[PDB]
From a paper:
Igni18 is an enzyme of the hyperthermophilic Crenarchaeon Ignicoccus hospitalis, one of the most fascinating and enigmatic microorganisms known so far.
We solved the structure using a single SAD dataset. Those are flanked by four helices on each side of the sheets (α1, α2, α3, α4 and α5, α6, α7, α8), thereby building the four-layered αββα core typical of the MβL superfamily. All interfaces between the three monomers have areas of ~850 Å2 with eleven intermolecular hydrogen bonds. However, both methods did not result in binding poses in which cleavable bonds of the ligands approached the zinc ions closer than 7 Å. These results, alongside the fact that soaking the crystals with ligands remained unsuccessful, suggest that the loops surrounding the active center were not crystallized in a conformation receptive for ligand binding.
Numbering used by the authors: 2 to 234
The structure:
């Protein structure tokens, strides 16, 4: 199985997993992006939009993306209610076992995870694990501090690639993201949610050298607009 992973700055990603395009917290137009919304829409196919929580830095350009592409959303129940009432089409879920998304693509599932953070009045914040044929490929942590159930995610699923926030202040710092990496058992970690604004300034290369000197995993510091392909067998 093949995962083509594009980073757009902040916590915005496009995950292509065997010819289905899944966007997560798609603030394409964040301050560090090198991609306009026009560029994104020409260059990526969007089949699903994952929203981890309701902060605007994460919802981002979701609504316009969904209007222009026809893509459905995937999100926690409260956000599903708010967006369904606003006229959008999507799948709602909650924290637990994966949702079966066969209609989107055969064998695809996504589970919502805990996250120690906030989400205005729109339910609770989440992370998201993308499965194919029962295997956890990508865990996008949303915004979060440490959460003890990260250990269960490691043990039960060991998602291959972990997208983890490292900027501090509003989320785990580097130090906490290190412990998280240990708990979650990724093969590779892409750091996110850093440098966009002063309170979240952190050095992703500092993160890298500590995770790797600990032999905890490989860290792929991505650049806004960069794509990287991963195979796991
Ligand atoms: K915004
Ligand atoms: Zn947030
Ligand atoms: Zn955020």
């Amino acid at each position: 199985t093949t995962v083509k992973l594009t980073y757009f700055g902040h916590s915005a990603f496009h995950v292509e997993v065997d010819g289905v395009g899944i966007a997560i917290d798609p603030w394409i137009t964040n301050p560090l992006s090198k991609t306009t919304l026009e560029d994104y829409l020409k260059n990526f196919k969007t089949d699903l939009v994952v929203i981890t929580h309701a902060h605007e830095d994460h919802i981002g350009d979701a609504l316009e993306i969904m209007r222009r592409t026809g893509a459905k959303f995937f999100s926690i129940h409260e956000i599903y209610v708010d967006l369904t009432q606003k006229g959008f089409q999507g799948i709602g879920a909650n924290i637990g076992g994966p949702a079966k998304l066969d209609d989107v693509a055969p064998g695809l599932g996504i589970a919502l995870t805990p996250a120690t953070h906030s989400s205005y009045d729109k339910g609770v914040p989440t992370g998201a694990i993308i499965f194919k044929d029962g295997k956890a490929l990508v865990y996008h942590a949303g915004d979060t501090g440490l959460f003890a159930e990260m250990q269960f995610i490691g043990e039960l699923y060991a998602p291959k690639v972990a997208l983890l926030p490292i900027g501090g202040h509003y989320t785990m710092d580097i130090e906490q993201a290190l412990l998280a990496t240990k708990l979650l058992r990724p093969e590779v970690v892409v750091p996110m949610h850093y440098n966009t604004f002063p309170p979240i300034r952190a050095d992703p290369n500092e993160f890298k050298q500590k995770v790797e000197s600990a032999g905890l995993a490989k860290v792929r510091v991505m650049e806004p607009g960069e794509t990287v392909t991963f195979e796991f067998k």
